[PDB]
C-alpha cells in the first residue's frame, strides 16, 4: 500500500477556488484534504472517526504551499501555470520506495533526486524552480527527511493504527442487461455497483466458454466505494447464450450473473 500526496497549485485560480490544494491517499482511500483557503489539513471519510498528528501535517503542508506559490515567481510569466507534485512512498524487507515527481501544465518536468538531494529535470522551467527552491532555508533538507523518514514512519503508523480501515471489503451488486444497438447486433452490459477494494474482474462467457472482456468503464462513488461496467457486442438473438462472471475480494467464489 502507498501513501501519496497529490499537490496542485494554479497561478490564476477561478474565483472562490484555492490557489493551492492537497489530497492524501492511503492506497485507494483518501485520508487527507488541504487547501490554501482553509489553511488546515483535515481527515477524509472513515479517517475522520479514527494524537497531535493533524497539527503537524497542517504545519508541513503550509510549508509546501509556500514552495509551490514561490515556483510561479521563479517562472515569471503573464500566462497561467499549473504546478503538480506527487510525493510519497511504498517494500520487500521493510524497505521504502520514495516517489517525488512534478508536472508543469500537465507535463512531467521535474523530480527530486534523492542521491544528490536536489530538484532536477531536463527543462529550463525545472532549472528555474529548482534554483529558487534550493535557496529557501532548509527546503532541500526537509524534502529529504519527508521522503526518506517521515513518509515511511507515517505509513507504518497508519498501517498499525488504521489496519481495519485499510482491510475494508464489500462485494459488488451485479446486473446484466441487453440493448438493441446495430441492426444485426446487440450490446450486453455487465454492471458492478458499490464495491470496496477497486480490484475487480468482469468476464463474458458464451455457453460457458470464454468470450473475453468488452469495453469497460470504472469510477468511484461518494463513499469511497467503486462502480464498474463492461459492455460486449453480440449477434442479435444470441444474447440468451451469454453469462457474466465477476471476481472480487468481497466474494468467496466467482459469481455467475444471468441476463433477463
Amino acid at each position: 500500500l502507498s501513501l501519496l500526496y497529490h499537490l496542485t497549485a494554479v497561478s490564476s485560480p477561478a474565483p472562490g477556488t484555492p490557489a493551492f490544494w492537497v489530497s492524501g491517499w492511503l492506497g485507494p482511500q483518501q485520508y487527507l484534504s488541504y487547501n490554501s483557503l482553509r489553511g488546515e489539513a483535515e481527515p477524509c471519510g472513515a479517517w475522520v472517526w479514527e494524537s497531535w498528528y493533524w497539527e503537524k501535517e497542517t504545519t508541513d503542508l503550509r510549508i509546501k504551499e509556500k514552495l509551490f506559490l514561490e515556483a510561479f515567481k521563479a517562472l515569471g510569466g503573464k500566462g497561467p501555470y499549473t504546478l503538480q507534485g506527487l510525493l510519497g512512498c511504498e517494500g520487500p524487507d521493510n524497505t521504502s520506495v520514495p516517489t517525488a515527481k512534478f508536472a508543469l501544465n500537465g507535463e512531467e518536468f521535474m523530480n527530486f533526486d534523492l542521491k544528490q538531494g536536489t530538484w532536477g529535470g531536463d527543462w529550463p522551467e525545472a532549472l528555474a524552480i529548482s534554483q529558487r527552491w534550493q535557496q529557501q532555508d532548509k527546503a532541500a533538507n526537509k524534502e529529504l527527511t519527508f521522503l526518506l523518514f517521515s513518509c515511511p514512519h507515517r505509513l507504518r503508523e497508519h498501517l498499525e493504527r488504521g489496519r481495519g480501515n485499510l482491510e475494508w471489503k464489500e462485494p459488488p451488486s451485479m446486473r446484466l442487461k441487453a440493448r438493441p444497438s446495430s441492426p444485426g447486433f446487440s450490446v450486453l452490459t455487465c454492471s458492478a455497483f458499490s464495491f470496496y477494494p477497486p480490484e475487480l474482474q468482469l468476464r463474458f462467457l458464451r455457453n460457458g466458454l470464454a468470450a473475453g472482456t468488452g469495453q469497460g468503464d470504472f469510477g468511484p462513488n461518494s463513499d469511497g466505494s467503486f462502480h464498474a461496467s463492461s459492455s460486449l457486442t453480440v449477434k442479435s438473438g444470441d444474447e440468451h447464450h451469454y453469462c457474466c462472471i465477476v471476481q472480487h475480494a468481497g466474494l468467496a467464489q466467482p459469481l455467475r450473473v444471468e441476463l433477463e
Binding site: 500566462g79 508543469l104 507535463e107 529535470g121 529550463p124
Partner: protein, 205 residues
C-alpha cells in the same frame, strides 16, 4: 490539390510552458468542394485533439489543421501522420513528420569578440559559435543586462565535417556600447544540453 506538413518550432519543443504544434496546410483545394476531412494519427493511433482553422479562400482554399503534441512524445521521435480527405482527391493524401533520427549531440557554445580591424567602425559585431549539434533544430538568442537585444541575425545550421551541425549568431552592437564594458550573453537552447539551456557571457577582457 497539395498537402504540406510542418514540424513544430524548436523553442516550443524545449519549453513545457510553450505549446508545440504540428501544422498541416492544404493548398490547391477546389472551390467545387470546400469540405476537407482531417484524420490525425500518432504511431498509427487516431487522435482527436487537433484544432482546425476555417477554409479561407486564389482558387486554393488554405484549410489548415494544427495538432498540439506532447513535449516528451516529440522528443522521443514519435511519428505524426495527417490524412486529408476530399471529393476532388481521388485517393486520400497522407503526410508524415517525425523528429530527425540520430543520437543527439550536446552543442558547444563559444563567444568571440569583434576583430581589431572592425573596432574602427561605428558598429562592432559580436560573434557566437554553436558547434557539434544534432538535430539541426536549435534556438539562439542574444541579451544584454537582462533586456534582450534585437539587432542579431543567426546563420542557418550548416552540416559539419564530423556529421554534426554548426551555427553562428552575429549581434551588431554600437562600438561605444562595447567599449563601455557591457556584458552581452548568448543564450542557446537544444535537446542535448543540460536543462535544454546554456548562456555564455562576453565583454572586454
Amino acid at each position: 490539390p497539395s498537402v504540406f506538413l510542418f514540424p513544430p518550432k524548436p523553442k516550443d519543443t524545449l519549453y513545457i510552458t510553450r505549446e508545440p504544434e504540428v501544422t498541416c496546410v492544404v493548398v490547391d483545394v477546389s472551390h467545387e468542394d470546400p469540405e476537407v476531412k482531417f484524420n490525425w494519427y500518432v504511431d498509427g493511433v487516431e487522435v482527436h485533439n487537433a484544432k482546425t482553422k476555417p477554409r479561407e479562400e486564389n482558387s486554393t482554399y488554405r484549410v489548415v489543421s494544427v495538432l498540439t503534441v506532447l513535449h516528451q512524445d516529440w522528443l522521443n521521435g514519435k511519428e505524426y501522420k495527417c490524412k486529408v480527405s476530399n471529393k476532388a482527391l481521388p485517393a486520400p493524401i497522407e503526410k508524415t513528420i517525425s523528429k530527425a533520427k540520430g543520437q543527439p549531440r550536446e552543442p558547444q557554445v563559444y563567444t568571440l569578440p569583434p576583430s581589431r580591424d572592425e573596432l574602427t567602425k561605428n558598429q562592432v559585431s559580436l560573434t557566437c559559435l554553436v558547434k557539434g549539434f544534432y538535430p539541426s533544430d536549435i534556438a539562439v538568442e542574444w541579451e544584454s543586462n537582462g533586456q534582450p537585444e534585437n539587432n542579431y541575425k543567426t546563420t542557418p545550421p550548416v552540416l559539419d565535417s564530423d556529421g554534426s551541425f554548426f551555427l553562428y549568431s552575429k549581434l551588431t552592437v554600437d562600438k561605444s556600447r562595447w567599449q563601455q564594458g557591457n556584458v552581452f550573453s548568448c543564450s542557446v537552447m537544444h535537446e542535448a544540453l543540460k536543462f535544454h539551456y546554456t548562456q555564455k557571457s562576453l565583454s572586454l577582457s
